[PDB]
Every structure is written in structure tokens, then in C-alpha cells.
Amino acid sequence: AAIDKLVKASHLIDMNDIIREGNPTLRKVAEEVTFPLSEKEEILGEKMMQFLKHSQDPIMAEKLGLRGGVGLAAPQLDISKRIIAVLVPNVEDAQGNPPKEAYSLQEVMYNPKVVSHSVQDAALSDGEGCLSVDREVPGYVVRHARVTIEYFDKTGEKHRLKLKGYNSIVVQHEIDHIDGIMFYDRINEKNPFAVKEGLLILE
Ligand SMILES: [Zn+2]
Ligand SMILES: [Zn+2]
Ligand SMILES: [Zn+2]
Ligand SMILES: [Zn+2]
Ligand SMILES: [Zn+2]
Ligand SMILES: [Zn+2]
Ligand SMILES: [Zn+2]
Ligand SMILES: [Zn+2]
């Protein structure tokens, strides 16, 4: 089955593993994982993080035919489990100095969920994209500005985390996937660029 192919030691995740808009797995509510994790579930998380590392690496992205990304959910690999990986890099300064921290967020999250959020909404100015969606989709994807999430790591340790800005948006977008929600579900149906007063537009 799909998970068996993905977790083979020599197997690298690429675009051929990513299912496409229309595939029913994208619309399911993914199943919670139980702890302790199976070896498959642990390796799957590791492969998913590796895929994001590769997508952000100039050489490996070219070798594998990948395009940059910051998040991946297991349903996108045809695996209906509540597993996501997020990897959001910090950026060099104007002088070309690497940041203090390589990443502002780097986690493989098991059973993640939003436990509370701000009343205020936010949206990326440039909209959102998706590896499973081979269409141009304009518009503000309206999300919570700030969230508090809970999730478990591969060890079963529970974490509780507050997020805002871009990382809030990235997380979620990935949580949506494990609930069978697609980004364009959160775009205004009649005017993609409608702005309800108070919306935080993120640059
Ligand atoms: Zn493959
Ligand atoms: Zn391991
Ligand atoms: Zn590598
Ligand atoms: Zn709680
Ligand atoms: Zn609420
Ligand atoms: Zn996505
Ligand atoms: Zn919500
Ligand atoms: Zn629509």
C-alpha cells in the first residue's frame, strides 16, 4: 500500500507521491494516530520532513523536480492519518548573514489541533498555493490571525504552542488537510479579494 512504498529506506518523496485535487482522500477526516507510533508512522513523519528540506534545498529540489514548500500533510500522500510536517525558514539579512535560527518553525506534528484562536482574522497578501492543486487560484485565504495549538511529537510528548503571523497561517493550512478542508474553501465566493474590516493582511 502507499505507506509501504513511502517508508522504504531508499525512497525519497517527490511529486509523483502527491495526490491531486479530486482524489477523495483529500476530503476525508484523517484518522488520529495512537501512541506508541508504529515504525511506519514514525518513518513517514521523517520522510515528510525530508521532503520539505529537499524542496527548500536548491540542489535537491532540482534533482527531484520539486518546488519550494513549507508544509505537507499525510493526506496529500494518500495517507489518511493526522500527521503534518511544517518547516518555515528564517531569511538572511541584507548583508547575506545567515539568521540566528535556521527556522522559525520546524516540527512533525501528530494529532495537531487548534484549541483556541483570536477573534481577528488574517490572510497572506499573496494568497496560498498547494502541491495537489494544479490551477491558479486567486484570493485571500481567510484564517485566524493567532492560534493556540496542541500536538504530539513522535515520542508521544504533548506540546501546547501559540502562533501568529506566517507560521499561524502555515499550521492552519496543514491542519485543514487532515480535516478534509482545502485552502480555496476559505476564499470569498463572490469577490476573492474582499476585505472585511479588521482583516490582518500579511505581507
Ligand atoms: Zn516516490
Ligand atoms: Zn526514526
Ligand atoms: Zn537529503
Ligand atoms: Zn488542552
Ligand atoms: Zn473558534
Ligand atoms: Zn496544502
Ligand atoms: Zn478555526
Ligand atoms: Zn469557492
Q: What is the resolution of this structure in A?
A: 2.0
Contact 112, 82 (CB under 8 A): yes
The rounded Å distance from CA 191 to ligand 8 centre is 10
The rounded Å distance from CA 189 to ligand 8 centre is 5
Spatial separation of the C-alpha atoms in residues 56 and 46, rounded to whole Å: 16
Spatial separation of the C-alpha atoms in residues 66 and 69, rounded to whole Å: 9
- Establish whether 11 is an annotated binding residue: no
Q: State the CATH number of the domain containing residue 191.
A: 3.90.45.10
What is the SS3 assignment for 4-39? Answer: HHHHCCCCCCCHHHCCCCCCHHHHCCCECCCCCCCH
Q: Which helix (H) or strand (E) holds 63?
A: helix 58-64
Contacts of 49 (CB under 8 A, 6+ apart): 85, 87, 106, 108
Tell me the one-letter amino acid at 182. M
Q: Dihedrals φ, ψ of 163, to 5°?
A: -135, 150
Contacts of 168 (CB under 8 A, 6+ apart): 122, 143, 144, 145, 146, 147
Alpha-carbon torsion angle 62, 63, 65, 67, nearest 10 = -40
Spatial separation of the C-alpha atoms in residues 33 and 109, rounded to whole Å: 11
User: What is the extent of the structural domain holding 124?
Assistant: 1-203
Spatial separation of the C-alpha atoms in residues 44 and 30, rounded to whole Å: 15
Spatial separation of the C-alpha atoms in residues 173 and 175, rounded to whole Å: 6
In the chain, how long is the greatest CA-to-CA distance? 51
The C-alpha cell that represents 120 in the structure block: 481577528
Which-ligand-closest: CA of 149? 4
The sign one gets for the Cα dihedral 19, 129, 122, 191 is: negative
Burial bucket for residue 14 (CB in 10 Å: 0-12, 13-18, 19+): middle
Burial bucket for residue 93 (CB in 10 Å: 0-12, 13-18, 19+): exposed
The rounded Å distance from CA 115 to ligand 5 centre is 8
The C-alpha cell that represents 162 in the structure block: 501559540
Counting the structural domains of the chain, the total is: 1
- Establish whether 130 is an annotated binding residue: yes
User: Strand 200-202 and strand 121-124: pairing?
Assistant: parallel
Task: Answer yes or no: 174 catalytic.
Answer: yes
Experimental method: X-ray
- Establish whether 173 is an annotated binding residue: yes
Which-ligand-closest: CA of 13? 1
Beta bridge partners, 103, equal 89
Name the one residue in this structure whose C-alpha cell is 482583516: 199
Contact 144, 31 (CB under 8 A): no
Spatial separation of the C-alpha atoms in residues 19 and 50, rounded to whole Å: 18
Spatial separation of the C-alpha atoms in residues 157 and 5, rounded to whole Å: 28
Please give the radius of gyration of the chain, using alpha carbons only, rounded to the nearest integer: 17
Spatial separation of the C-alpha atoms in residues 2 and 74, rounded to whole Å: 11
Note residues around ion ligand 8 (Cβ under 5 angstroms). Answer: 189
